[PDB]
Design a protein around this ligand. Structure first.
Ligand SMILES: CC(=O)CC(=O)SCCNC(=O)CCNC(=O)[C@H](O)C(C)(C)COP(=O)(O)OP(=O)(O)OC[C@H]1O[C@@H](n2cnc3c(N)ncnc32)[C@H](O)[C@@H]1OP(=O)(O)O
Ligand SMILES: CC(=O)CC(=O)SCCNC(=O)CCNC(=O)[C@H](O)C(C)(C)COP(=O)(O)OP(=O)(O)OC[C@H]1O[C@@H](n2cnc3c(N)ncnc32)[C@H](O)[C@@H]1OP(=O)(O)O
Lengths: 418, 418
């Protein structure tokens, strides 16, 4: 009689190539430690035009269906969160439906708000099910993006690309979400944006970090109030946020997770009924606790550090990395998730990891996904960057994966790997 | 103890200018009767670059809040359905939030699937509320679009523009929606699309009509099965679809509603347990019933015929025109709605018109909205069409409305009329 809803499983797709981030530093005249220590990066996914938003989304969604033995006719919603759209009207979701040969009894659409678009679609799918409308069916929500700032830009070492496909159902083996407890904070800003007809993003980098932390603070506080009233956390000898077993954050670069966690802890320390007894110095020293970061956040960054920013998918890659190794230990425990998108909006939500989470993550076979990639030179990365969007390289997709092959008469053509 | 969810109220914004459709015919060497009788058009909204997707959406949403005395701090979701997006990352919804000076505790994002994007967002808002997550709050879903096919194209006489803002709540005075009964039908097609960097749509016009009717048939049949099982309609002396008091359809051009209604009735006639006793000729003659079209559909086209296709908003302009005059008579009666977007997806859903629907429509003051417009020449429409997107005309917005004024350093600037 206890109904549940949330994420049942996930799958990951990554571009076929990456570069070593220290190679990028040397090519840019930058100290490699700025990237490896300052940003937390190790490897950066790079793309060619054949690895477009559709190809990556379809690869991830097809992999989800195969790895988890999803019955395609049970999918009632297919949503793609992206900020790398390829048509003003025709959604990536419709291309994915066709490439996967999915049947007709489903909503299809894309959701857009920078790196928050995937979470927006996840909540639409969750609440479709939780309203009863989706009872007996599942949704697939795919976060797919290619993050491009441009050669010789400050954002360049945070680039990346890929997709995460989420299975959403009444059997949320990965994360049984606490419906209705979300905190949200949004405001109209120009921290990061990408006008139509611009291939590379515009960004005010340090301002965008301030906006992330400001929106995080509002979203987390909103969740905390509802979690307090639902009895899930208390003001005790432990801070409210310390009672979450883990917290995953949107990862534009890996060091951002430490900034975010410090800010979240500062929200508890500033808001405690006895905060007047503290100073900025004592609060910051407690908030920055290495023990808390190590216990709640550190193990969520293994995949992100090898891929880069994947915009809508970055938070879900962090969820994936966390559960990849700790799903069994986390079963029955509640964790928190912070989604941010520039523009901007943040949402903080929680859920309980399922008993079968380890099973579902084993089937995602994520080290095999990352192992199929190949390293290229910075010179080759630059050559591929300069290719127009309609000039895919002449290479076949891996088995079950997809590539854009050409655009003919304004129609995009794809190939599936044998 | 009877919980309800759906559309509480709506508001409309239209561009400041229109052309007489017979003037367009004469300028194109076309028989004006092709447009007035063949398509059902009377007046076509035309825009200048200052009437962009944001300006129209913000005008409609601000008008909703003022006309319906919405408490802005009760808005927990602001979604814009559009296929006329203006940034790859930053959503129209975030601009609308800022222009309206709305507070921070809301999700913001855009939804995309051609003319289905508004309905997708409506369902996300409805199910957010119906899941319980939105209990005590409201959503605003804005359908905003400018339909542009180009000078001397077959689609040109179906152009239009505007926005409809929907208030969604537990007090659905316009339409208490039947949660969970929706029928849906989607498939990957290239009937109509608009690649990034193309200002005008691409379309295979007659194929797009076939796709609309095919998807309508699947969506309607899906709803009908669920409505039968919920006891809302029966196979009786009346066809199932005849038991809906009215049916509103996506209106790309006004004559499309008659094609759609005929197709819906054909679905009942082909599917009746005793269909073997009929012929294509006898079914078509019954399906095309003028009495049924007059009783269920005809009064939904008054606004559409004076505006044109507004993509995501067209169905909701048809809902608006229906309730503008018949809300009191329809109170307590169930009506049907068919949303279609090219690409493609259709969804058919139903709801009951509320006792206070007439009150809410009176406050929308729709004849005043349409009366503020001015007629221009085809020559002037063509001059405005040739203006680049970053070259708004130097004209002030009407009181409470918005216009794009300029793009400076890649940042869009707006003005609010005094
Ligand atoms: C974009 C989204 O996805 C949405 C969001 O999350 S917005 C928030 C995140 N924003 C982004 O990712 C925007 C895109 N990226 C950028 O604009 C830039 O990459 C950036 C602002 C993240 C950094 O660019 P930058 O100005 O060149 O680097 P800078 O801030 O000076 O240094 C970065 C770190 O490296 C440190 N560092 C520099 N050189 C170092 C060295 N030799 N050894 C060790 N550390 C070094 C710096 O001290 C700094 O550390 P802290 O953050 O701990 O203070
Ligand atoms: C786009 C969306 O919003 C999503 C959708 O709904 S897709 C479905 C609708 N598709 C569109 O609107 C696409 C954009 N529009 C178009 O492509 C075109 O405008 C169109 C296909 C709708 C019509 O273009 P066309 O080929 O030039 O017109 P054509 O089909 O020959 O004639 C239209 C009607 O006018 C009639 N007609 C022509 N001349 C006439 C005259 N002198 N007197 C009376 N009637 C006349 C025709 O007989 C026809 O009537 P029927 O539909 O009842 O048979």
């Amino acid at each position: 009689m206890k109904k549940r809803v949330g994420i049942e499983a996930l799958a990951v797709a990554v571009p076929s190539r990456y570069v070593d981030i220290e190679d990028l530093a040397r090519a840019r005249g930058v100290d490699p430690a700025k990237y490896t220590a300052g940003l937390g990066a190790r490897e950066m996914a790079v793309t060619d035009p054949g690895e477009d938003t559709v190809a990556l989304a379809a690869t991830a969604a097809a992999r989800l269906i195969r790895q988890q033995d999803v019955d395609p006719s049970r999918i009632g919603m297919l949503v793609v969160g992206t900020e790398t759209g390829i048509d003003h009207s025709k959604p990536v979701a419709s291309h994915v439906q066709g490439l996967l040969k999915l049947p007709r009894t489903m909503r299809t659409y894309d959701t857009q708000h920078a790196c928050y678009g995937g979470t927006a679609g996840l909540m639409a799918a969750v609440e479709w099910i939780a309203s009863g409308a989706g009872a007996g069916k599942v949704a697939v929500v795919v976060c797919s993006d290619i993050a491009r700032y441009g050669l010789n830009t400050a954002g360049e070492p945070t680039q990346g690309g890929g997709a995460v496909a989420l299975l959403v159902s009444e059997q949320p083996d990965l994360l049984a979400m606490d419906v209705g407890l979300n905190g949200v904070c949004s405001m109209d800003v120009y921290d990061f944006w990408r006008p139509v007809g611009r291939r590379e993003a515009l960004v005010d980098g340090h301002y965008s970090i301030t906006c992330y932390l400001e929106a995080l603070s509002g979203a987390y506080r909103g969740w905390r109030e509802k979690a307090l009233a639902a009895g899930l956390v208390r003001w005790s000898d432990a801070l409210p946020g310390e009672q979450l077993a883990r917290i995953a954050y949107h990862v534009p670069f890996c060091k951002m997770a430490r900034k975010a966690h410090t800010q979240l802890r500062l929200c508890d320390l500033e808001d405690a009924a006895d905060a007047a007894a503290s100073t900025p110095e004592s609060r910051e020293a407690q908030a920055k606790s290495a023990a808390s970061y190590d216990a709640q956040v550190a193990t969520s960054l293994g995949l992100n550090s090898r891929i880069g920013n994947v915009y809508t998918a970055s938070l879900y890659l962090a969820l994936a990395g966390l559960l990849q190794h700790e799903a069994g230990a986390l079963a029955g425990q509640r964790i928190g998730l912070l989604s941010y998108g520039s523009g901007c909006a943040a949402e903080f939500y929680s859920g309980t990891v399922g008993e079968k989470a380890a099973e579902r993550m084993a089937k995602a076979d994520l080290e095999a996904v990352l192992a199929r990639r190949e390293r290229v030179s910075i010179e080759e990365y630059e050559r591929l960057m300069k290719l127009p969007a309609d000039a895919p390289e002449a290479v076949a997709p891996s088995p079950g994966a997809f590539r854009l092959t050409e655009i003919r008469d304004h129609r995009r053509q794809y190939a599936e790997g044998n």
